[PDB]
Structure formats: C-alpha cells, structure tokens
Write a protein that binds this ligand. Structure first.
Ligand SMILES: Cc1cc2nc3c(=O)[nH]c(=O)nc-3n(C[C@H](O)[C@H](O)[C@H](O)COP(=O)(O)O)c2cc1C
Ligand SMILES: Cc1cc2nc3c(=O)[nH]c(=O)nc-3n(C[C@H](O)[C@H](O)[C@H](O)COP(=O)(O)O)c2cc1C
Ligand SMILES: CS(=O)(=O)c1ccc2nc(NC(=O)Cc3csc(-n4cccc4)n3)sc2c1
Ligand SMILES: CS(=O)(=O)c1ccc2nc(NC(=O)Cc3csc(-n4cccc4)n3)sc2c1
Ligand code: NA
Ligand code: NA
Ligand code: NA
Ligand code: NA
Lengths: 311, 310
C-alpha cells in the first residue's frame, strides 16, 4: 500500500528509467543507472543480434540490479533482437518507433515485462489490451524520432485512457519534471537527454559538451517534410540537412547525408558530421554528473516540490 | 493572498483566462473575473472603438479585476495602447511580439504588464523593462504558437527571472495547475478550455469542434511562412496544408486564410472557419460555467498537491 507501482513491478528502488537511446545507451550507462537504483536500458537501435548480446553480457557483469533492453522496432534485426531478449532472459524491454503487437504473446509467455512507447491514445489502449506492463507517453519535446503531442497533454490523456502505469518521457531533466509528471498522472519517468551528460555514458565528450552548450531553441526538427520528424541539436549537419529538405533534395540525397550521422556523434564526436540527437531538455542540462548523483538529486527534489508524491 | 499572483492582481484564484482573438469578449472575461480568476478581453486585430465597447460592457458586468490582451501584430496596436492607458486598464497581457517600445508609457501609467514570452531572452528582457510577470506559453497552446513545450519552457523561464511566471499551453484542469506549479509557475493561463464555457460567446459549432476534438486534431499550419498556427483539423485547415504541400506561396496562403477565424467564431462555418485551439482541445469534454471550471481546477490541484501555494 502507498508503494510506487513501477518500483514494485520492476523491483527497482526509484521510478526513474534511463531511456533506450540508439548508439548512446550502452552497458556503461545502463549498469550505472541500475546500480543507482533506477532502470538502465541497453539500446538495440539498428545493431545486429551479436552486438547487443555483447552489451547484455557486459551489463550483467557490471550490475546485479534489474535492467532492460529497448527494441527499436524499425531495426532490420528486430526479429533477432526479440529472439535475443527471450534467449537472454531479459526481465523488461521497452519498445519504440512502432507497434510491437506481433511479439507481445511470445514476450508475455516468456515472462518479459513489456513497456512500449506510445504517441497516441489508441496505441496506448491497444498496448494495454495486448498485455503491456506499462506504457511510456513520450512528448514531442524528447530527442530522436518524435511524436506530435507534448508531454503536458499526452501524459494525462494516456493516464485517462489506460489502467496500467504510465511513464512520462520528453523534457524531464530534474525533480521538477518528475513532480510535474506525477501530477499529470504518471507513475514513473523516462529520461534520455539528461543521461547523455552522465559520467558513465560512453558517447564522445564532444556530444556531452554540445548538450551542455545547448540553448533554449537549439533542439530543432528535421524530417517534417516526410513522415518521421527527428529532433536533434543545431550544428552544421542538421542545418544543412534541413536546408536540403526545404530545397527538395531527393530521398536518396538525404539518405547519404544522414547515413551514420548519429554514430559520427557518439563515436567520433564529429561536430560537423554528427547528428547530436537531444530533446528540448538539452537546454536545461548544465553539468556532467554520475548517474547516482543525478537520480538521488532527482528524487529528493521531486519530494521537496511535491511531498505527496508516490515514489 | 499568499499566492504571489493573487496578491499582485487582487484576485481570488491564480487562474487567468487567456486573451483569445475574436473569442474572448466581455461575456467570457466578466464571467471569469466574477468567478475569482482574471478575465481578459482580447484586442486581437480589432480597431480602438470595437475594443473600447468591450471594456465598457465588461465594467457593467463585473467589478472584479480584469485585463486586456494587446496583440502586438495588430494594425491598430498603437491605438490599443492608447486605449489601455486612457481607460486606466489595471493589467494587460501582450502576445505575438516584443512590447519594449511601450514599457515606459505603460509603467508611468501604472499599468501592470504581463507579456507572453516564448524564449529565455525575451523573458529576461521583459523583466528588465519592468514586466509585472511573464506568461510562458508552450507550443501545445492554440493560435500563433512558439516552438518550446510547456514542460521545458516554464522551468527555464522560472530559472531566468525573479518575477512570477504564469504557465500557459495545455492546461485544462487541476493536473495541469499542479504540474505547472511543480515547474515553477505561480499561476496558469488557460485558453482552449474556456472556449467550452457557457459564457464564451463563440458560435455553438466552435464549442462542438473543441468538445469532439481527438488527440491529434490540433494541427499546425503555416510552418512554411514562419508564422505557425495551431488549429483544429477541418476542410479549411486540411486545404491550407494541401496548399503548402503543393508549394503554395505566402500570398496565396494569406488570401486563403483571410477572415477565417471570424468565420469560426461568428458564423461557426465548419468548412470555412479556422478553429484555433490547443492540443488541450482533446481533453475538453464538457461545456461548463466558468465558476465551475475554475473551482473544480483549484480543488483538484489542491487534492493532487496538498501543499500547493494557490
Ligand atoms: C539520441 C537519442 C536516441 C534515442 N533512441 C531511441 C531508441 O532507439 N528507441 C526508443 O524507443 N527511443 C529512443 N529515444 C527516445 C528516448 O528513449 C527517450 O524517450 C527520450 O530521450 C526522452 O526525452 P528526453 O530526451 O527529453 O529526456 C532516443 C532519444 C535520444 C535523445
Ligand atoms: C483561438 C485563440 C486565440 C488566441 N488569441 C491570442 C491573442 O490574440 N493574443 C495572445 O497573446 N494570445 C492569444 N491566444 C493564446 C491564449 O491566450 C493562450 O495563451 C493559449 O490558448 C493557452 O493555451 P491553451 O489553449 O492550451 O489553454 C489565443 C489562443 C487561441 C486558442
Ligand atoms: C537506430 S536510429 O539511429 O536510427 C534511432 C535514433 C533515434 C531514435 N529515436 C527513437 N524514438 C522512439 O522510438 C520513441 C518514440 C517516439 S514516438 C514513437 N512511436 C511511434 C509509433 C509507435 C511509437 N516512438 S527510435 C530511434 C532510432
Ligand atoms: C488577431 S488574430 O486573429 O490574427 C490572432 C489569432 C490567434 C493569435 N494567437 C496569438 N498567440 C499569442 O500572441 C501568444 C504567443 C505565443 S508565442 C508569442 N510571442 C512570440 C514573440 C513574442 C511573443 N506570443 S496572437 C493571435 C492573433
Ligand atoms: Na524519441
Ligand atoms: Na544546456
Ligand atoms: Na498562441
Ligand atoms: Na475533446
């Protein structure tokens, strides 16, 4: 009674999930978040089965606490990643960038808890009917491939539509966003951009530093002309990509410009060729900090702001 | 008055009914003020004489504080500022620009000025030039929007200024009030929810389109002109989008959208109107007296956040 539902179901100390973040989120980050009492997440991204297997194996060496894997449903290896989840006995997965409906029964029967990101009420309701453990309502202010609705309106609508716990994502960097999210009906938060600037995140230092330097309007959106808006920091790449879209460049021309761009950011920190994906939250990130300090300060500040909060 | 905005504005509840061009007339503004919030008469694009009539009629309907919104893109903005000072309006909000050039005239007149700000820089500039408070309006609001969402804009503006911050964009009930106060706001400004108040004088069809709006119905037109507008999906707003996808020019769009908001508010023309509204429209489910809207909001916020400083 009076216990946080996400903490109880996932067996974690704090209802803070570090979001799966393609290329960004590796065993160093996931294990640090789980060791700090939240839920670390290894991102499958577009990587093949054998690469994510190594991350899972390495993560289990670094933490005894629960962690998850994010299945990014647009991946060409999505079927292999789902196999890997079940083979490796991963306790929990999140999903993004699509509808995981066709895997829910295999995952549910295998005991895996499934937490899909949902950008609409209809998908939230469908996920609850197919047996989702929880859903993540990610607002458009988040980094990466975004939906249309903001966190402020999406979280309460999803909470009104389903009875399973709702996890707020998009724009949360500190205890203020946690308290706001819980007031809107969430039982936990998922945090991406802030954890790029954790010490244990393995991205190139230039990526962390560009997030630190980000100003209020620096997290721009490319790909609106098409069907998949992507939020990323202003730099030479993203500005020229946006101009190419606006000047009617072909789907092929755009493909070559953007191919490998996120990896150029995370591996090489290449400030001219990288796509430094980040939410509008990037403007509020001010320090590189160990995950333990981030999470403990997050929950303490949420309590101070909203003493009634059910953490 | 413990709450800072309640003290400064001498109102019972820190709930402001946002100025809403063509929508917010004396009937709505007086009802909100009578209910203990701050009603606002929208100057919009209208001339001095039309807005003067609204101020006079509002005074006949309430003796509670109310304000006027100066919409800074109006062709008559100079006349409206003149009117504000001439009629000794106690408080104004501003939108759609930077009211820097009026701040000395307004502060010598004693006018409390509360500008809408979409950036940290404009927030800090308004504080430096004497703003009483600022409104941080997130992109989820209706009408001519900024880019940043409420979730990230409110805490950044609160971190940037010492004057009170008013959250706007997406607030329809006490959850949004509690969330806004958690982010650092001292009050909320609410637009779309009050379209579905009994006292709002828009055509019934406008209220219905808000009532029946789905989660994704409040779409953005005019990205290609640099003046984005959030409005409900309908024949007019689809065609505006289909025109942009066909490479329409700004002049073609501007002629297409002429008088569209008036078609919505006066005639309720479901095909020809621009029914501007926030993503909040999806959450609006009842047409309700303003007093009940505001009392229910405040009571719910206190229930969620017992220590809230309302
Ligand atoms: C660089 C980056 C990569 C991401 N990759 C994924 C992904 O592969 N799968 C997914 O579901 N979400 C992905 N996300 C979304 C995050 O998991 C998270 O929901 C989002 O970052 C939260 O918003 P915030 O950045 O404002 O904290 C990514 C976000 C970023 C910034
Ligand atoms: C139809 C409509 C007209 C508006 N007109 C104005 C205006 O003239 N001046 C202004 O500053 N804001 C204007 N706004 C913004 C509102 O004052 C308010 O900040 C916004 O509606 C809050 O977001 P919400 O609709 O989600 O509650 C308008 C909003 C709407 C929906
Ligand atoms: C592997 S990568 O480098 O190409 C890459 C980079 C960034 C990125 N960011 C993503 N963000 C999500 O997946 C979360 C989300 C928002 S809306 C939505 N959704 C839509 C239908 C169903 C869910 N999911 S995926 C993704 C993939
Ligand atoms: C008179 S009308 O029918 O043509 C019309 C219709 C809708 C409408 N909605 C508006 N919304 C705002 O003014 C609030 C806002 C958001 S961002 C911003 N801002 C940018 C720089 C400085 C402030 N102001 S004005 C406006 C005018
Ligand atoms: Na995303
Ligand atoms: Na920053
Ligand atoms: Na607006
Ligand atoms: Na509705």
């Amino acid at each position: 009674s009076h216990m946080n539902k996400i903490c109880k179901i996932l067996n974690i100390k704090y209802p803070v999930i570090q979001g799966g973040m393609a290329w960004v989120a590796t065993a160093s980050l996931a294990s640090a978040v789980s060791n700090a009492g939240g839920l670390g997440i290894i991102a499958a991204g577009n990587a093949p089965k054998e690469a994510i297997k190594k991350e899972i194996v390495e993560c289990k060496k670094l933490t005894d606490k629960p962690f998850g894997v994010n299945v990014m449903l647009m991946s060409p290896f999505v079927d292999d990643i789902i196999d890997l989840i079940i083979e490796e006995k991963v306790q929990v997965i999140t999903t993004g960038a699509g509808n995981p409906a066709k895997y829910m029964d295999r995952l549910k029967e295998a005991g895996t808890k499934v937490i899909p990101v949902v950008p609409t009420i209809a998908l939230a309701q469908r996920m609850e009917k197919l047996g989702a453990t929880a859903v993540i309502a990610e607002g458009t202010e988040g980094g990466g491939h975004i939906g249309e609705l903001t966190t402020m309106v999406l979280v309460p609508q999803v909470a009104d539509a389903v009875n399973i716990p709702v996890i707020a994502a998009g724009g949360i960097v500190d205890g203020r966003g946690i308290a706001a999210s819980f007031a809107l009906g969430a039982s936990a938060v998922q945090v991406g951009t802030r954890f790029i600037c954790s010490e244990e995140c393995s991205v190139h230092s230039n990526y962390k530093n560009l997030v630190l330097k980000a100003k209020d309007r620096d997290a721009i959106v490319t790909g609106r002309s098409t069907g998949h808006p992507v939020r990323t920091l202003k730099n030479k790449l993203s500005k020229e990509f946006l101009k190419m879209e606006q000047n009617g460049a072909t789907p092929e021309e755009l493909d070559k410009k953007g191919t490998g761009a996120l990896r150029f950011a995370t591996v090489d920190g290449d400030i001219e060729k990288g796509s430094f994906m980040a939410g509008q939250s990037a403007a509020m990130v001010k320090e590189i900090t160990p995950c333990k300090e981030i999470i403990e300060a997050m929950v303490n500040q949420a309590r101070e702001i909203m003493p009634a909060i059910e953490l």
